[PDB]
Design a protein around this nucleic acid. Structure first.
Ligand code: FME
Lengths: 271, 46
RNA sequence: GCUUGAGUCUCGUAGAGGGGGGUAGAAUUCCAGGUGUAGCGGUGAAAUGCGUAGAGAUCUGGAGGAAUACCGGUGGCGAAGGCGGCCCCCUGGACGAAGACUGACGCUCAGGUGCGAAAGCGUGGGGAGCAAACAGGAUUAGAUACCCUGGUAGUCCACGCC
RNA sequence: AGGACCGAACCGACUAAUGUCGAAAAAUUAGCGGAUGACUUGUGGCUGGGGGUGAAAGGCCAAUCAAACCGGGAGAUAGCU
RNA sequence: GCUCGCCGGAAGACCAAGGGUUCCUGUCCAACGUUAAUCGGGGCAGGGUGAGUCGACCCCUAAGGCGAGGCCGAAAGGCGUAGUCGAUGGGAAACAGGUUAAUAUUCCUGUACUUGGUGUUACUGCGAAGGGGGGACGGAGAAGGCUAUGUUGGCCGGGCGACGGUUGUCCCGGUUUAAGCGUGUAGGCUGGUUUUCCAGGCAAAUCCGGAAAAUCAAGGCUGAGGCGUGAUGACGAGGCACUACGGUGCUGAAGCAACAAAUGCCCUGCUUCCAGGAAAAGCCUCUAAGCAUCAGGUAACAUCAAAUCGUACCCCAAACCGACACAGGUGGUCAGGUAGAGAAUACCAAGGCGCUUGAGAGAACUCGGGUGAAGGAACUAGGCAAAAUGGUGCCGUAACUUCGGGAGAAGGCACGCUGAUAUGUAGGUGAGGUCCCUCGCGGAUGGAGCUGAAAUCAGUCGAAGAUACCAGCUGGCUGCAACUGUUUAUUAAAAACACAGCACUGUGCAAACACGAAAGUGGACGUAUACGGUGUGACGCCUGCCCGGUGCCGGAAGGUUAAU
RNA sequence: AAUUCCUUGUCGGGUAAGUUCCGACCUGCACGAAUGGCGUAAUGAUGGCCAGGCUGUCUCCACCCGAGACUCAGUGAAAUUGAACUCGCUGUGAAGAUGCAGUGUACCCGCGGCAAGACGGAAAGACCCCGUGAACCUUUACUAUAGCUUGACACUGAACA
RNA sequence: CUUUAAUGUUUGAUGUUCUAACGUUGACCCGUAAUCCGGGUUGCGGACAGUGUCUGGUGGGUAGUUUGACUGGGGCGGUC
RNA sequence: CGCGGGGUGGAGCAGCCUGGUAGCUCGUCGGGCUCAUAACCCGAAGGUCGUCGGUUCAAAUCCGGCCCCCGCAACCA
């Protein structure tokens, strides 16, 4: 729900808090958590590898299973859960044999819904199946690349992968970014489309918002002096060079698609 | 303002310690030199 | 009080009436491959453009978005605007039949409310074709027009405004 | 609810005066700005010299910075004083 | 020693940190103190720091460090697993009184508590680097109930008072009490219990988790404070007694009620909100490899141990940092009375100081301020400096607008004191009595006492009643920037930067990018509604034309074209 | 106009008086549509102009209360300084003279003051130039190089179309 | 000599398949309670990718330096 | 103070670069189609190639003086 807060104070006049009334009003399943100390974007050497990362609220990591390695065992989604890590609010699911777990939540999935992980399961939003027995032309998510890696694609809110066709042994997929790639039929695709689609409607209104999430401010290149950035200097922002990354590499039109060990996979590159 | 030598014996001994110098490569040669000059107080402590 | 006003119930009839969810075929375009080759396309004429890096044409497969040939009718429904491939679900109004029932419960209505083609506007997707603005080539005394070749918004979808 | 207002502790440092061999190698005095926040702060760690860090001034890196300090090249070189 | 004055959210009292005997006592005056000095943080000499309960060491971890093998690297060496270190974190247990020149939650007296060892008796199955619960947690906000604590009164003790009144509704001092134990309330949380079964928790399982049955409606967990005990005890004003005239011995009344009230406690609560808020061990408990005449565990009891280091003093400063006995800086805790909303401020209490050069003079001038005739920005680069407004309730308030605001817009009225309404109201709190009872810290009822706004009316004092400290100058046109914010510490605080939003582009995960000779990491245990780069900078209306040049991307037939 | 050189452009408003300011006219030396254009309530220790209020800022200051300054006693620096019996003036002069010439004036020596000179003291001028000096920074300055990227040889083989 | 044609033969460029090199930040097991690592089964790619050497291009991201003189001051202009 | 390019019918440009041949649109004269102009269709005339000298078979061309024009100069403490 695009719930806009009224314009009381400046900064508050452009806030869109897409809140949710279906999550559990309380602290989550304690056994399925583990600490998560952000390193602020620094490697072992200690030098800032990635810029704009520092500060932010402390978070606790909920170990979410993507593999779904339990065939023929019924499960029930007891309650939804807000996640500090993903954009996809995970759902606390209880397997009917006495073991609770966390998994991404599909579209119209509500509390108390029944699912099952395996080849035996029929078609219903949230069911996971080894891609072969899935209606060729459906919509899935959390597809594994390596059959056993766990889960690799479309894991964020509102995303979905369309299965084109199963020719031979490789499944032709279609990502949201239009890059159709061939992956073997041995993987596991969870049917449906990732829930909480109104995530991309959420604006943060204030500057302090992006900061308590964890993102440090970005210092533009036309402001930095020539000694610290390729662009820079000049009396009145005398810009006039070619836009590059702060390390010389040209941006705004430069294919760094340098893989070659996976071009056999990619069929149709970004349209 | 705030003068620049805050007294903290821990940090005085963490990165200036006998066990701190004698640990790494460079540190030992340093301790070699202070002995080499014949200085009494190698790296000040208690 | 009554009944020739109005309204209602029982059984049936026709229908592009509206909304929501799927599905179907041809055609256009595009991607890839096989065959094959100097023109294709366009116009009153011509040129831009496309083409020997091998198009168009042709065969096969695949991915698409939009609108539904014939049925189609000064034919139908609705308050008007407007709405047509088929199927499912929810659902509205009109009409007929033989009776019963309440018994003037009505007509219109400033203010007020709602609906309301297209175009346009906001958020987020979709994007085949078509196509303002725009560009090039022509016409022209000049052509920011009529023509043609390309082509963005938009056109389509869900929620709102006008 | 609030990067909300007034305003102390707290922190910062816009104006004027005094000071400039000062009380102080940038402070005090009388007023200011913020003060539930992008807040401040104690204890303790990590990133180091052609490198660190930077809400980006070529500022900051032990009163020292368009390339720190210390030792070694080195009694460097000077058509100069 | 007697007066005066200063701070009193400190210039007071205690700790961490860090200094290292600066603490106390006796003695000395050259050198140190910006003056003298029989004085002292100076010199010489002697003494002092007492712990099972405080901190630390110790058990256990976080950021992160080291790190046998390992991957890798000219060498040095780098990263990293098992492990092992590392608090500002979590984990067992004590308070009051008295004493010393200097120390005491440590000494002494009194009253209590905790973890382990061996042994005794009676029962019972116990047992891991393994599993589970707990530990274990965010921000803000409102509310109920109490305490620390204050005040009045009562009572006890003393006085009735050097200038007028003062045996009375007068005045002064005191009215203090913990840890532990028992009870276990206000309040909050949660449905207990019994039976059976199970692809679950790397295995096991009675522990947890799950699904069906069953009986009944509570049981249990947790919990400040009060009340009793602690305590016919300690302490206690004032007397009683000797002076080395510094102080010591002895004795000892009252010791309660009531109201008000914390940021402290219940609360490591409750409601709500979203940015979604450690880990491990101690503890309780189940079993594995197994061991059962055993070994161990549970309960009661006796006895023993609880080591080592620090403990002095300074601790918002003459003892730390600043070369100084320096108008600077330094984290945390306790923090009274009146006025006041208040931790502001002003005056005081406890307590501590008068800043380690003074005595005269009152000249110019400088500096910090007080006041002013008439005028009131004519000053000047410019209203800079000063001056003025300044509080509470209420009335009223425009252009504009994103419909939040603008706004405390501007501009105004009433404010002291006394009495009355009413021997101090509304409100708040609330004993005794009475009744009931699933009998306790109970529920209604009842109203003494106590505390105490404000409104109205009348009268009166002064020039003035937010009389002081404290405490906005207001409005109009307009550029720039959106705004809060950040910045050249030590000459520039803005129009510069950041900024939410927007746009392009790169990226299919061993992702691009980045640090790194490599390994390994960050990106992210994220994955196209995601991450990285660049550019502009909210919102609203828009964002035109040029692909010649440069760069980038696509297409590559052909020409040129290195090594081989 | 944070942009307009010429320039105090032109007309009007405010003031007795307006090189600033406000609103427009376009002749834009040399605005311009994300190195964004035009408006913008709210906000602002921001830049500029105007009115009121209030005042010593000013016409023109005056008095007063303190801390220094002054004296006395104790303690006791500092930058600077070749040597000094250390006057003005006219002229000359390495070109503005305390020091030379001419000339007038002037008892020797303190203190309280005030700042015209000693081209006063403090900074081996930071301004300009020179030095076949240095250092960072830019690029279609010269030459290399990390990285990225092309291909060949090697680790690297065997079949058929 | 040219145009062509069957074959023997000598090398090369493509297309596809295969498995042993190799990769494997796929699953699992053991060392071992150990997300490092090694090896073993199996799966997925595949003589690619990656790395060494030679070499062409790009290349201020980085580094070493040059960047004339006279000049009625420098600079602009001019000249040598 | 200099460098670069140019000067071609009435307007303006081709040709120059790399030596033997001077073109196009409008305009001028005029006719035609129209009741009239414009427009249009069509034909012809119109060029000492700024000027002089040199050179070779031939100078618009290759070269050297003079004159005219555009951009930059008209400085900084
Ligand atoms: C010119 O007068 C010159 C300008 C100096 S700017 C640092 N001033 C003094 O030399």
């Amino acid at each position: 729900a695009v719930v806009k807060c009224k314009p009381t104070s400046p900064g508050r006049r452009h806030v869109v808090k897409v809140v949710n009334p279906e999550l559990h009003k309380g602290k989550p399943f304690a056994p399925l958590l583990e600490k998560n100390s952000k390193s602020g974007g620094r490697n072992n050497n200690g030098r800032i590898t990635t810029r704009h990362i520092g500060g932010g609220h402390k978070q606790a990591y909920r170990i979410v299973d993507f593999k779904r390695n339990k065939d023929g065992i019924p499960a029930v989604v007891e309650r939804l859960e807000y996640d500090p890590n993903r954009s996809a609010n995970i759902a606390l699911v209880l397997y009917k044999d006495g073991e609770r777990r966390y998994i991404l939540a599909p579209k119209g999935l509500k509390a108390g819904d029944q699912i099952q992980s395996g080849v035996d399961a029929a078609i219903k939003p949230g069911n996971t199946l080894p891609m072969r027995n899935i209606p060729v032309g459906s919509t899935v998510h959390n597809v594994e690349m390596k059959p056993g890696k766990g889960g690799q694609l479309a894991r964020s809110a509102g995303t979905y992968v369309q299965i084109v066709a199963r020719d031979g042994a490789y499944v032709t997929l279609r990502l949201r970014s239009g890059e159709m790639r061939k992956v073997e039929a041995d993987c596991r695709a969870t049917l449906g489309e990732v829930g909480n689609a109104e995530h991309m409607l959420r604006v943060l209104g204030k500057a302090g918002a992006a900061r308590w999430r964890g993102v440090r401010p970005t210092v533009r290149g036309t402001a930095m002096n020539p000694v610290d950035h390729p662009h820079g200097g000049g009396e009145g922002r005398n810009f006039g060079k070619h836009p590059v990354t702060p390390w010389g590499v040209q941006t705004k039109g430069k294919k760094t698609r340098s893989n070659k060990r996976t071009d056999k996979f990619i069929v149709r590159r970004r349209s | 303002m705030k003068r620049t030598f805050q007294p903290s014996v821990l940090k005085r001994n963490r990165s200036h310690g006998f066990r701190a110098r004698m640990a790494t490569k460079n540190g030992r040669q340093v301790l070699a030199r202070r002995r080499a000059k014949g200085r009494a107080r190698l790296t000040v402590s208690k």
